[PDB]
Amino acid sequence: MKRTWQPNRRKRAKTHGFRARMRTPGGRKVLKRRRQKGRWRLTPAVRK
Amino acid sequence: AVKKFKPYTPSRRFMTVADFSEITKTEPEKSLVKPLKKTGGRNNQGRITVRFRGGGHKRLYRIIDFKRWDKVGIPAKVAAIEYDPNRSARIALLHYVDGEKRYIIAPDGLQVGQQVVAGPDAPIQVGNALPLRFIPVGTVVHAVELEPKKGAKLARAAGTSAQIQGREGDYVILRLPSGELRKVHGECYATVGAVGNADHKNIVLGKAGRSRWLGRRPHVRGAAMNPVDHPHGGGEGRAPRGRPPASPWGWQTKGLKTRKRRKPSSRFIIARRKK
RNA sequence: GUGGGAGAGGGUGGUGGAAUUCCCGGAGUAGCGGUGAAAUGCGCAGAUACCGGGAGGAACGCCGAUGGCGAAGGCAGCCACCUGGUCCACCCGUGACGCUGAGGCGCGAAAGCGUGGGGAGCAAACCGGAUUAGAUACCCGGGUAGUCCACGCCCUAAACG
RNA sequence: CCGAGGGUAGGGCCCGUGACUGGGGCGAAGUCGUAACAAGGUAGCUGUACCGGAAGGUGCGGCUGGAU
RNA sequence: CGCGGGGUGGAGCAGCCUGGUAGCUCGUCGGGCUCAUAACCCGAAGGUCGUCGGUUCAAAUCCGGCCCCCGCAACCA
RNA sequence: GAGCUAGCCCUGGCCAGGGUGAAGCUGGGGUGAGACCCAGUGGAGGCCCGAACCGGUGGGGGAUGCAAACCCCUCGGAUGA
RNA sequence: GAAUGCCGGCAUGAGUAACGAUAAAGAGGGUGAGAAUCCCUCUCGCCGUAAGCCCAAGGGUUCCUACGCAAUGGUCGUCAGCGUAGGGUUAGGCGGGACCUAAGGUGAAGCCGAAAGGCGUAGCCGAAGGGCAGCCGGUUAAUAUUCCGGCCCUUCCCGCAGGUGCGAUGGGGGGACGCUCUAGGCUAGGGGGACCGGAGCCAUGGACGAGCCCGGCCAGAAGCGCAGGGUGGGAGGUAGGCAAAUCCGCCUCCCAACAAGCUCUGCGUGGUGGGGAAGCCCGCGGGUGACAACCCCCCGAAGCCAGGGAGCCAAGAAAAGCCUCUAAGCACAACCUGCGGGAACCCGUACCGCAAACCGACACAGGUGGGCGGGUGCAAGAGCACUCAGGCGCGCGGGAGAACCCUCGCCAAGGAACUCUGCAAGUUGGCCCCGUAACUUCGGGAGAAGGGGUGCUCCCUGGGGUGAUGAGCCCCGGGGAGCCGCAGUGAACAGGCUCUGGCGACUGUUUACCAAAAACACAGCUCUCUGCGAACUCGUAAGAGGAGGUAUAGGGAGCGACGCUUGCCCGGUGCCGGAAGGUCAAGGGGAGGGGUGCAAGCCCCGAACCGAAGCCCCGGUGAACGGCGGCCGUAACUAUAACGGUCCUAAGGUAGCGAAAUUCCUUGUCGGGUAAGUUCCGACCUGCACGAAAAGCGUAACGACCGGAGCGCUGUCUCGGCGAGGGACCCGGUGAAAUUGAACUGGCCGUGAAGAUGCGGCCUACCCGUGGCAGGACGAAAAGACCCCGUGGAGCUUUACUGCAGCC
RNA sequence: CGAUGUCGGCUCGUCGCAUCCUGGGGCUGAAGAAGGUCCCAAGGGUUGGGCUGUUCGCCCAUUAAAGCGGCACGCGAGCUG
Ligand SMILES: NC[C@@H]1O[C@H](O[C@H]2[C@@H](O)[C@H](O[C@@H]3[C@@H](O)[C@H](N)C[C@H](N)[C@H]3O[C@H]3O[C@H](CO)[C@@H](O)[C@H](O)[C@H]3N)O[C@@H]2CO)[C@H](N)[C@@H](O)[C@@H]1O
Ligand SMILES: [Mg+2]
Ligand SMILES: [Mg+2]
Ligand SMILES: [Mg+2]
Ligand SMILES: [Mg+2]
Ligand SMILES: [Mg+2]
Ligand SMILES: [Mg+2]
Ligand SMILES: [Mg+2]
Ligand SMILES: [Mg+2]
Ligand SMILES: [Mg+2]
Ligand SMILES: [Mg+2]
Ligand SMILES: [Mg+2]
Ligand SMILES: [Mg+2]
Ligand SMILES: [Mg+2]
Ligand SMILES: [Mg+2]
Ligand SMILES: [Mg+2]
Ligand SMILES: [Mg+2]
Ligand SMILES: [Mg+2]
Ligand SMILES: [Mg+2]
Ligand SMILES: [Mg+2]
Ligand SMILES: [Mg+2]
Ligand SMILES: [Mg+2]
Ligand SMILES: [Mg+2]
Ligand SMILES: [Mg+2]
Ligand SMILES: [Mg+2]
Ligand SMILES: [Mg+2]
Ligand SMILES: [Mg+2]
Ligand SMILES: [Mg+2]
Ligand SMILES: [Mg+2]
Ligand SMILES: [Mg+2]
Ligand SMILES: [Mg+2]
Ligand SMILES: [Mg+2]
Ligand SMILES: [Mg+2]
Ligand SMILES: [Mg+2]
Ligand SMILES: [Mg+2]
Ligand SMILES: [Mg+2]
Ligand SMILES: [Mg+2]
Ligand SMILES: [Mg+2]
Ligand SMILES: [Mg+2]
Ligand SMILES: [Mg+2]
Ligand SMILES: [Mg+2]
Ligand SMILES: [Mg+2]
Ligand SMILES: [Mg+2]
Ligand SMILES: [Mg+2]
Ligand SMILES: [Mg+2]
Ligand SMILES: [Mg+2]
Ligand SMILES: [Mg+2]
Ligand SMILES: [Mg+2]
Ligand SMILES: [Mg+2]
Ligand SMILES: [Mg+2]
Ligand SMILES: [Mg+2]
Ligand SMILES: [Mg+2]
Ligand SMILES: [Mg+2]
Ligand SMILES: [Mg+2]
Ligand SMILES: [Mg+2]
Ligand SMILES: [Mg+2]
Ligand SMILES: [Mg+2]
Ligand SMILES: [Mg+2]
Ligand SMILES: [Mg+2]
Ligand SMILES: [Mg+2]
Ligand SMILES: [Mg+2]
Ligand SMILES: [Mg+2]
Ligand SMILES: [Mg+2]
Ligand SMILES: [Mg+2]
Ligand SMILES: [Mg+2]
Ligand SMILES: [Mg+2]
Ligand SMILES: [Mg+2]
Ligand SMILES: [Mg+2]
Ligand SMILES: [Mg+2]
Ligand SMILES: [Mg+2]
Ligand SMILES: [Mg+2]
Ligand SMILES: [Mg+2]
Ligand SMILES: [Mg+2]
Ligand SMILES: [Mg+2]
Ligand SMILES: [Mg+2]
Ligand SMILES: [Mg+2]
Ligand SMILES: [Mg+2]
Ligand SMILES: [Mg+2]
Ligand SMILES: [Mg+2]
Ligand SMILES: [Mg+2]
Ligand SMILES: [Mg+2]
Ligand SMILES: [Mg+2]
Ligand SMILES: [Mg+2]
Ligand SMILES: [Mg+2]
Ligand SMILES: [Mg+2]
Ligand SMILES: [Mg+2]
Ligand SMILES: [Mg+2]
Ligand SMILES: [Mg+2]
Ligand SMILES: [Mg+2]
Ligand SMILES: [Mg+2]
Ligand SMILES: [Mg+2]
Ligand SMILES: [Mg+2]
Ligand SMILES: [Mg+2]
Ligand SMILES: [Mg+2]
Ligand SMILES: [Mg+2]
Ligand SMILES: [Mg+2]
Ligand SMILES: [Mg+2]
Ligand SMILES: [Mg+2]
Ligand SMILES: [Mg+2]
Ligand SMILES: [Mg+2]
Ligand SMILES: [Mg+2]
Ligand SMILES: [Mg+2]
Ligand SMILES: [Mg+2]
Ligand SMILES: [Mg+2]
Ligand SMILES: [Mg+2]
Ligand SMILES: [Mg+2]
Ligand SMILES: [Mg+2]
Ligand SMILES: [Mg+2]
Ligand SMILES: [Mg+2]
Ligand SMILES: [Mg+2]
Ligand SMILES: [Mg+2]
Ligand SMILES: [Mg+2]
Ligand SMILES: [Mg+2]
Ligand SMILES: [Mg+2]
Ligand SMILES: [Mg+2]
Ligand SMILES: [Mg+2]
Ligand SMILES: [Mg+2]
Ligand SMILES: [Mg+2]
Ligand SMILES: [Mg+2]
Ligand SMILES: [Mg+2]
Ligand SMILES: [Mg+2]
Ligand SMILES: [Mg+2]
Ligand SMILES: [Mg+2]
Ligand SMILES: [Mg+2]
Ligand SMILES: [Mg+2]
Ligand SMILES: [Mg+2]
Ligand SMILES: [Mg+2]
Ligand SMILES: [Mg+2]
Ligand SMILES: [Mg+2]
Ligand SMILES: [Mg+2]
Ligand SMILES: [Mg+2]
Ligand SMILES: [Mg+2]
Ligand SMILES: [Mg+2]
Ligand SMILES: [Mg+2]
Ligand SMILES: [Mg+2]
Ligand SMILES: [Mg+2]
Ligand SMILES: [Mg+2]
Ligand SMILES: [Mg+2]
Ligand SMILES: [Mg+2]
Ligand SMILES: [Mg+2]
Ligand SMILES: [Mg+2]
Ligand SMILES: [Mg+2]
Ligand SMILES: [Mg+2]
Ligand SMILES: [Mg+2]
Ligand SMILES: [Mg+2]
Ligand SMILES: [Mg+2]
Ligand SMILES: [Mg+2]
Ligand SMILES: [Mg+2]
Ligand SMILES: [Mg+2]
Ligand SMILES: [Mg+2]
Ligand SMILES: [Mg+2]
Ligand SMILES: [Mg+2]
Ligand SMILES: [Mg+2]
Ligand SMILES: [Mg+2]
Ligand SMILES: [Mg+2]
Ligand SMILES: [Mg+2]
Ligand SMILES: [Mg+2]
Ligand SMILES: [Mg+2]
Ligand SMILES: [Mg+2]
Ligand SMILES: [Mg+2]
Ligand SMILES: [Mg+2]
Ligand SMILES: [Mg+2]
Ligand SMILES: [Mg+2]
Ligand SMILES: [Mg+2]
Ligand SMILES: [Mg+2]
Ligand SMILES: [Mg+2]
Ligand SMILES: [Mg+2]
Ligand SMILES: [Mg+2]
Ligand SMILES: [Mg+2]
Ligand SMILES: [Mg+2]
Ligand SMILES: [Mg+2]
Ligand SMILES: [Mg+2]
Ligand SMILES: [Mg+2]
Ligand SMILES: [Mg+2]
Ligand SMILES: [Mg+2]
Ligand SMILES: [Mg+2]
Ligand SMILES: [Mg+2]
Ligand SMILES: [Mg+2]
Ligand SMILES: [Mg+2]
Ligand SMILES: [Mg+2]
Ligand SMILES: [Mg+2]
Ligand SMILES: [Mg+2]
Ligand SMILES: [Mg+2]
């Protein structure tokens, strides 16, 4: 059947993208905990 | 007249459509139409405010002159009569002698090619707009401004009409289509005559598809719901109300007058609607 | 054919007044209303009765008749438009073109039916009060369809001279 | 080939019959009321509509085959 | 068989915080009115209070035991 | 977190073929004019058969499965909500 | 030493199940240490509206080549989408950007919110929509509308020549639009040829032939031809298009109009540039064929002309490019036309792409949008059967031919006797014609039912299209005579039908993953609210929706097409109405009392009375919440009770229906069907416990709904038998799992916590496997979901308590 | 209750005797035939169908007879549902 994941690079970058987290105050805290933790990916890797 | 159909399908048995006899022009005027924003009951928050709306046919908003005092004294000629899907009424395309083309609601009896004129110097004949103080008492009107220079707000549906019952000081008394007697100012404009397409209420939709074409989504009964969705929901088996008939928000819907008693318009309303 | 005459003959569009009911204001108080007698009812929350104002619907007093018109059913304030029928005079024209009429077609009071409006009064069903052995009635107080309009059905009668 | 007839399938009309049901006709002395005949004690009859154990009552219109 | 309510004149019902009075309607009977019945008017009669115990000075009444009558309940499996 | 799903908005796309034969129109009949009737044309429909497509009725299989929803036979819709 | 403990390791099941669609393989040659699995050839099978080809999304080097096989590949492996290395993606014209705008997002102004932040006409962002200038071939191991070859085109800059009042973010036109049907002409595509070209072939009985086999085109600027789209020209006035306007709109008049002209597009021709098979040779391409031929006829699109036409209602985006108008401004400028020269950027371009490369943990029988999708036959068709081009034989095989299972085929006689039930499987099947009932809302029912025809050959003949009016080709027929077989939609693809009741009118929708229904929805009916800054809804607000709507409209509720109807109760509750009265908080008022101070004073209580909503109270209201009785007696046989009495209520169930989706007793009783009927149907009515919009009673049509019956036909059954394939079985390769206290694990009668392999007494039993069947191990699985317990939790309800939003 | 799957049907049987039939008997209100009752006996047999989920039961047509029970109301690691 049709599964939950139907990738779209357009949807990937406009939902979990860096500009998307920086607009909302909750997403700026996402990047704060993520830099503090030391993750190598601050946002999911997407190409175009 | 109302056009019916033979029962070749079960829906065509009761389905009725309008005669569309008064329509002379098929497509609207390009310089007067603009797109209509379809909401589907959604507000700026994206939430449904008014339940069961959406899925209608695509429409174009026809700019209707609900003022008519922009051009006082300048006569116009009824170039054509068209259909407006944003309302029950039919519209009249007006070619003024000034050169500007406009749209007004087409009143009953308005023939194509005759001349209309707005202003206090206008005669009393169908299609003409005058302030409520210059229209004679006892004549039926429509497109009535409720407050001066705010636009036509009264008697705009198909087949509706309001009658001047008298004058009292600076205001006039009007019998609205709900039967309500209200005191409206005399400088408020009104186009004389009743609105056309009086056979609009005689249209039987025939099937559920016609409601979906108009934008009317299926209405769910509260009894068919559950207790989290409605007060009438619940009960093993079919069950009655068990409480006074209420809306999904808690308020009763059988007799509850929801009008604000301290509204300042109560001082200008003589009698409430009856029947 | 010409020239006239009467008439609630029919359809449409307007319009006048009296009266009933309801609303608002004034003024006023201890009852009103109703019957054979009462009671329900309405009424100190100010009714009835009275004055003024407004809304709405229906029906047209006097004229009015032992009258008129229409084929019948039926038709009554008034104005106007459209229109049917009939009668008199002249003796002008056509020259039997006439009479009736199974079917057919049309009209057809009231009640009823569908869609929509309108609903003041009245009023089946219904409710109450009385009468009564009982009263699903007569009497009374309320009262919904209906009565009214537009369109479409119904086509019955003591549709009787 | 036609062909009496036989078979299959579906119709039409008529007759007999059927639990039960509907009104009807009739049968001296059963029961309930008293609608009509007199102004029959609410004048009657009528078409229609609604109601009521029942005759019937009431509304709308019509008739006199209604006395004073 | 588990809860609640009731058995009162020929019939239907009251009288029970109430201990001490048994009341209302219809019927029955006697007399009127009528030719006569019905209606109506006048005047009467009519009750072991289901039954047996107990409490009490005194039980239709208060409290138990059965005898009937009625209405609910008889659930999860 | 609406890339699954539910609804709505914007812009596009898709629905082989066959069958039934509404209104209207034309012609004739009918009438005082009509209503109406017949024939032809016409090609309407939450119309029919039926694929693609969207579903998921009944049964069988599958049950550490090909598959944390599948497969086979059969079945509903398929110009519309 | 235990916590269904945690982490790791290794066992057991066990050489067991499985090796992932039953589309299928066999032989020869080669490589190599090694080959069922790699390469080649031959034969066979499978797809062919795909299992072939192109594009988008996604993926991100998987592409190509060379050397390799430890691991990945369900086996093997010399092979590979695997490992190492190198190579490979070329654009002014294709897609995106330097153009436009939609929903939406953002957001100068502005508005709002403790803060964060939320709105917001303009503007900007935003695409698979609008706009936009390249087609054919060749080439590489791998890219090509990109490189090359041929022929075309666009924008920008500069120069020259001609022309004009030039000029914009502004005005106007245009862009600019639905659904269904459809005309004419072309094209894509396809079929045929007795014609043209071609390597060849004559087999096995026949054929040197109008023989078989193969192929018979693509693109192409300006011209020209054909077919279509768009569009009137002039003059005068002009107060509107937020300044201006010669443009546009409005008015008048003249010219002409199914045209013509102008412009634009498609198609054909077109200078010229390419391509070019079968076969045969050299080995996944190349050469030859070949100086290849490159014509004629027919079918004909859903694509093109296109912004075509017609009909219908549900009334069918915006903005820029483009044309025009003028404004500042400039008229040495600027714009247009033509010509010439120069300039032309960034990103993508490999490969998979219905799949071994995407989404499903797998090289997973699942899911995935668009375009092309040939031929023949079946009425048509994208269906179905075979088959072009192209791609595969699904990455374990070889044997055997047990039980059993799956999938399939057939069957005597019977024909539903099976069973909860004809569940399943049969029968029926397409087309043409004849014919067709109750009932009906007159459409329907209806494919009713039932029945005949269907192949081939020959003869005669009618109509249409293309041609021309004829031949030829193509389509649709009609009649007559024959032939064959068991059978003519000879295979494949295609309803079993009827009578009758319940429910819902219907098409639809729904529990993704146990329920598709009688539930939801629905047109339609009614009640109620709402006069617009509407009611209502979301939000603290601003603001939105409602609605750019205005009572023929909008919100809420119940009922649910239609037909006939929806009776009585307003006592309680809700709602609506009521300038009285009663109660009523803050506040006002302050008779009076108190504290303190020597005092003026200061301070604290405080009665009458005034004082809203609400409640009380008086009315109204049922398509508002709801409710619609009990006992006794009476008819001249009995029986029953039309009638009466009495008690209670606010009023005591009207019509219609009724053992019903409702009836406990109940398989009520009677009838029908049956040989027999707890079901079904028709009635009766003592309706435990129907009932009139939580509608009542009917109702044509419809239903993968639920009952009952009949015909047809059957392996459903009596009653089973046989046959096929895939497993099971054996052998080779790989090789799990839940489970498991240890185990050397018999029966019976007892006993034991009450159901013993393990205790007792007897009996029985050599050791160990393999295929099978499942009675036991209270077998496995899931700390019972039923039940209770816990002063555990959560969803829900209300006249439970308390509080909040909201409203008054 | 860290699970003993629950009615009935199907398939498969096995046992008990308080015996439905068949066999051997005693008494009889046993003439004969056929019954009634009781004793012995479990070796074999104990039908098909309509109704209902039904066990049971009623009914149809037979029969020598159409027995009653136990086996976790035997039997779902055999099936149905
Ligand atoms: N005549 C036939 C019909 O009779 C009806 O009436 C019938 C009954 O109503 C009527 O019953 C009557 C009754 O009215 C009257 N009050 C009492 C009388 N005993 C009865 O009489 C009836 O029954 C008895 C036996 O029972 C018979 O002997 C007698 O013949 C018969 N008429 O007797 C008639 C039957 O005979 C209607 N009156 C009438 O409309 C209609 O015509
Ligand atoms: Mg997916
Ligand atoms: Mg995942
Ligand atoms: Mg994308
Ligand atoms: Mg780093
Ligand atoms: Mg009209
Ligand atoms: Mg019609
Ligand atoms: Mg219908
Ligand atoms: Mg349009
Ligand atoms: Mg526009
Ligand atoms: Mg927004
Ligand atoms: Mg938002
Ligand atoms: Mg909505
Ligand atoms: Mg508009
Ligand atoms: Mg709808
Ligand atoms: Mg619309
Ligand atoms: Mg609904
Ligand atoms: Mg529910
Ligand atoms: Mg919720
Ligand atoms: Mg609730
Ligand atoms: Mg409820
Ligand atoms: Mg409720
Ligand atoms: Mg439930
Ligand atoms: Mg219920
Ligand atoms: Mg419910
Ligand atoms: Mg209710
Ligand atoms: Mg509430
Ligand atoms: Mg009124
Ligand atoms: Mg008079
Ligand atoms: Mg003369
Ligand atoms: Mg009449
Ligand atoms: Mg009438
Ligand atoms: Mg009384
Ligand atoms: Mg009255
Ligand atoms: Mg009525
Ligand atoms: Mg008369
Ligand atoms: Mg014959
Ligand atoms: Mg009388
Ligand atoms: Mg009398
Ligand atoms: Mg009388
Ligand atoms: Mg009655
Ligand atoms: Mg009456
Ligand atoms: Mg008369
Ligand atoms: Mg008389
Ligand atoms: Mg006496
Ligand atoms: Mg005498
Ligand atoms: Mg007497
Ligand atoms: Mg419970
Ligand atoms: Mg319970
Ligand atoms: Mg999420
Ligand atoms: Mg979505
Ligand atoms: Mg069609
Ligand atoms: Mg359809
Ligand atoms: Mg396709
Ligand atoms: Mg399925
Ligand atoms: Mg499963
Ligand atoms: Mg199907
Ligand atoms: Mg279909
Ligand atoms: Mg321990
Ligand atoms: Mg441990
Ligand atoms: Mg093991
Ligand atoms: Mg082995
Ligand atoms: Mg094993
Ligand atoms: Mg094995
Ligand atoms: Mg195996
Ligand atoms: Mg495989
Ligand atoms: Mg070899
Ligand atoms: Mg070698
Ligand atoms: Mg492939
Ligand atoms: Mg990947
Ligand atoms: Mg790699
Ligand atoms: Mg490769
Ligand atoms: Mg390897
Ligand atoms: Mg190896
Ligand atoms: Mg390997
Ligand atoms: Mg694998
Ligand atoms: Mg090697
Ligand atoms: Mg590699
Ligand atoms: Mg180029
Ligand atoms: Mg670009
Ligand atoms: Mg640039
Ligand atoms: Mg932009
Ligand atoms: Mg914002
Ligand atoms: Mg953006
Ligand atoms: Mg684009
Ligand atoms: Mg585009
Ligand atoms: Mg481009
Ligand atoms: Mg080449
Ligand atoms: Mg290239
Ligand atoms: Mg190319
Ligand atoms: Mg120029
Ligand atoms: Mg210019
Ligand atoms: Mg411009
Ligand atoms: Mg448009
Ligand atoms: Mg449309
Ligand atoms: Mg061609
Ligand atoms: Mg062809
Ligand atoms: Mg050819
Ligand atoms: Mg030979
Ligand atoms: Mg201007
Ligand atoms: Mg050309
Ligand atoms: Mg070649
Ligand atoms: Mg050569
Ligand atoms: Mg297409
Ligand atoms: Mg067009
Ligand atoms: Mg349409
Ligand atoms: Mg826009
Ligand atoms: Mg712009
Ligand atoms: Mg740049
Ligand atoms: Mg590329
Ligand atoms: Mg590809
Ligand atoms: Mg595809
Ligand atoms: Mg692949
Ligand atoms: Mg594989
Ligand atoms: Mg993978
Ligand atoms: Mg796959
Ligand atoms: Mg899908
Ligand atoms: Mg798909
Ligand atoms: Mg053939
Ligand atoms: Mg076919
Ligand atoms: Mg095609
Ligand atoms: Mg196929
Ligand atoms: Mg094949
Ligand atoms: Mg091939
Ligand atoms: Mg057989
Ligand atoms: Mg048979
Ligand atoms: Mg059945
Ligand atoms: Mg079946
Ligand atoms: Mg029949
Ligand atoms: Mg027919
Ligand atoms: Mg047939
Ligand atoms: Mg043959
Ligand atoms: Mg052609
Ligand atoms: Mg096949
Ligand atoms: Mg078939
Ligand atoms: Mg079929
Ligand atoms: Mg039934
Ligand atoms: Mg249905
Ligand atoms: Mg419905
Ligand atoms: Mg659905
Ligand atoms: Mg489900
Ligand atoms: Mg689930
Ligand atoms: Mg269904
Ligand atoms: Mg399902
Ligand atoms: Mg329901
Ligand atoms: Mg509706
Ligand atoms: Mg209805
Ligand atoms: Mg809210
Ligand atoms: Mg709006
Ligand atoms: Mg707008
Ligand atoms: Mg319902
Ligand atoms: Mg009612
Ligand atoms: Mg009634
Ligand atoms: Mg009643
Ligand atoms: Mg009553
Ligand atoms: Mg009440
Ligand atoms: Mg009340
Ligand atoms: Mg009251
Ligand atoms: Mg007072
Ligand atoms: Mg105070
Ligand atoms: Mg108050
Ligand atoms: Mg009550
Ligand atoms: Mg008696
Ligand atoms: Mg019954
Ligand atoms: Mg029964
Ligand atoms: Mg029963
Ligand atoms: Mg029962
Ligand atoms: Mg009876
Ligand atoms: Mg009865
Ligand atoms: Mg009941
Ligand atoms: Mg109700
Ligand atoms: Mg219903
Ligand atoms: Mg019902
Ligand atoms: Mg019914
Ligand atoms: Mg009917
Ligand atoms: Mg269904
Ligand atoms: Mg359906
Ligand atoms: Mg078998
Ligand atoms: Mg075989
Ligand atoms: Mg086999
Ligand atoms: Mg074997
Ligand atoms: Mg084996
Ligand atoms: Mg041992």
Ligand SMILES: [Mg+2]
């Ligand atoms: Mg024991």
Ligand SMILES: [Mg+2]
């Ligand atoms: Mg033991």
Ligand SMILES: [Mg+2]
């Ligand atoms: Mg031991």
Ligand SMILES: [Mg+2]
């Ligand atoms: Mg021992």
Ligand SMILES: [Mg+2]
């Ligand atoms: Mg076992």
Ligand SMILES: [Mg+2]
């Ligand atoms: Mg266990």
Ligand SMILES: [Mg+2]
């Ligand atoms: Mg537990």
Ligand SMILES: [Mg+2]
């Ligand atoms: Mg559960």
Ligand SMILES: [Mg+2]
């Ligand atoms: Mg419990």
Ligand SMILES: [Mg+2]
């Ligand atoms: Mg508990």
Ligand SMILES: [Mg+2]
């Ligand atoms: Mg507690």
Ligand SMILES: [Mg+2]
């Ligand atoms: Mg405790």
Ligand SMILES: [Mg+2]
């Ligand atoms: Mg608790």
Ligand SMILES: [Mg+2]
């Ligand atoms: Mg337990």
Ligand SMILES: [Mg+2]
């Ligand atoms: Mg255990």
Ligand SMILES: [Mg+2]
């Ligand atoms: Mg069996």
